[PDB]
């Protein structure tokens, strides 16, 4: 290689090299000071400014400090404001700025930086691809879709753009349309396409249209390290946790919780029925595109280890009962919720995002016929007042063909083999 030195910078290369050598040798504090001195003496030097930013970046890593990193992010921008900045340096500085803004969770800031990059380098397709990711990270699928449509208009066979366009189409329930983009994108082998998210959604789109090739893609995704197995396809995992579709209470160790749910199941049922009868708007329809058809709604008391205070006003005894069990109330990768499903419902085969939880189901109102749940290769039914336990990281599927409603209580627990240290440090999902 990159050309990072402007005319003046070539005249001070000896000083610039001396400072960078300190950085490369790990003398970060000395390197910071060396580049700070260069920025003082040569305030317009783009290479000196970039060196200062790189040292602040390394220092932020050394001190694990977001504030130090915020300084680097500003200095990376200062490089771009200086006169006569070489094109290669301008791109490197603003790209790293955007990347570090994303690390900090400053997604709107990264977006503005990525927008500037595309304006400065209009023919760089990689930068537009990066802008699309910026929109995806903030949840703006509509603008991300338009970015990848622009990329595919000029480079139709860009595989990064194909898989991401396919991902967006799938999210919008354009299943058939998404398959060729996801498939051709993965097959391109372009950098960024060998990603478990695209294998996950290609196979799922294929399953939804009845394409039996789905599991060849799950097999390949497993062989390439994205899935623990063809059946267990979660992407936010702690490696090595016991992997089994169905669990007994004793196997989980959470026997006191299970005893409490089964001994007190009728109070849990009754509060759920009262909400159905007098506060039915607390049941929210499932909103993750997991239904082929039918009506399925959830009343959530806990999510991400956080109690919903207003919801617990609707099930106060159930919330009081459950507060004695932090193995569920503190499961920041699970929920506690009522789940109602009505006749004519089919839930698509799907997997949850993480192997770090197990999912308990307490039967509350179970019709005598028509309701069942498959996990992996094994299908079961619910019983009123009894707990079933499965690992939702394994593919599972549900049918409701009874002649009345089916109500269960879903209680997520931390995987029993996760230590307290792990349970405290895993990011919430």
């Amino acid at each position: 290689k990159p050309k990072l030195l402007n005319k003046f910078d070539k005249t001070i290369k000896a000083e610039l090299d001396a400072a960078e050598k300190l950085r490369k040798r790990g003398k970060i504090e000395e390197a910071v000071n060396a580049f700070k001195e260069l920025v003082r003496k040569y305030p317009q030097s783009p290479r000196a400014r970039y060196g200062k930013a790189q040292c602040e970046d390394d220092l932020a890593e050394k001190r694990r400090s977001n504030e130090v990193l915020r300084g680097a992010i500003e200095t990376y921008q200062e490089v771009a404001s200086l006169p006569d900045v070489p094109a290669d340096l301008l791109k490197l500085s603003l790209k790293r700025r955007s990347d570090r803004q994303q690390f900090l969770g400053h997604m709107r800031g990264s977006l503005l930086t990525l927008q500037r990059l595309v304006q400065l380098f209009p023919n760089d397709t990689s930068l537009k691809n990066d802008l699309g990711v910026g929109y995806l990270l903030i949840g703006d699928n509509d603008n991300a879709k338009k970015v990848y449509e622009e990329v595919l208009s000029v480079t139709p066979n860009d595989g990064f753009a194909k898989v991401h366009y396919g991902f967006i189409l799938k999210a919008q329930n354009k299943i058939a349309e998404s398959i060729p983009y996801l498939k051709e994108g993965i097959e391109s082998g372009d950098p960024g396409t060998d990603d478990g998210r695209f294998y996950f959604h290609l196979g799922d789109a294929m399953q939804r249209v009845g394409n039996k090739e789905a599991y060849k893609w799950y097999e390949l995704g497993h062989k390439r390290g994205h899935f623990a197995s063809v059946w267990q396809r979660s992407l936010y995992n702690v490696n090595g946790l016991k992997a089994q579709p169905w669990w007994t209470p004793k196997e989980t160790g959470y026997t006191e919780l299970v005893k409490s749910l089964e001994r007190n199941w009728k109070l849990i049922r009754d509060e759920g029925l009262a909400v159905m009868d007098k506060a039915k708007g607390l049941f929210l329809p499932e909103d993750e595109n997991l239904r082929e058809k039918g009506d399925w709604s959830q009343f959530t008391l806990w999510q991400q280890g956080r109690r919903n205070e207003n919801a617990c006003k609707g099930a106060p005894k159930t919330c009081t009962l459950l507060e004695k069990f932090p193995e569920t109330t503190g499961c920041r990768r699970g929920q506690i919720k009522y789940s109602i499903m009505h006749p004519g419902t089919h839930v698509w085969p799907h997997t949850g995002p993480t192997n770090c939880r197990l999912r308990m189901h307490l039967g509350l109102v179970i019709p005598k016929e028509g309701c069942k749940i498959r996990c992996a290769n094994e299908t079961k039914t619910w019983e009123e007042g009894k707990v079933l336990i499965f690992d939702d990281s394994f593919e599972h599927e549900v049918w409701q063909d009874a002649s009345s409603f089916r109500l269960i209580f879903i209680v997520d627990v931390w995987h029993p083999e996760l230590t307290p240290q792990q349970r405290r440090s895993l990011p919430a999902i």
Binding site: N66, E286, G352
Partner: peptide
């Protein structure tokens, strides 16, 4: 949106730096 029950979002965790 949150990845409550599937993997429908591009990312399922929040970004908070160090």
């Amino acid at each position: 949106g949150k990845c409550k029950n599937g993997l429908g979002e591009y990312t399922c965790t929040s970004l908070e730096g160090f």
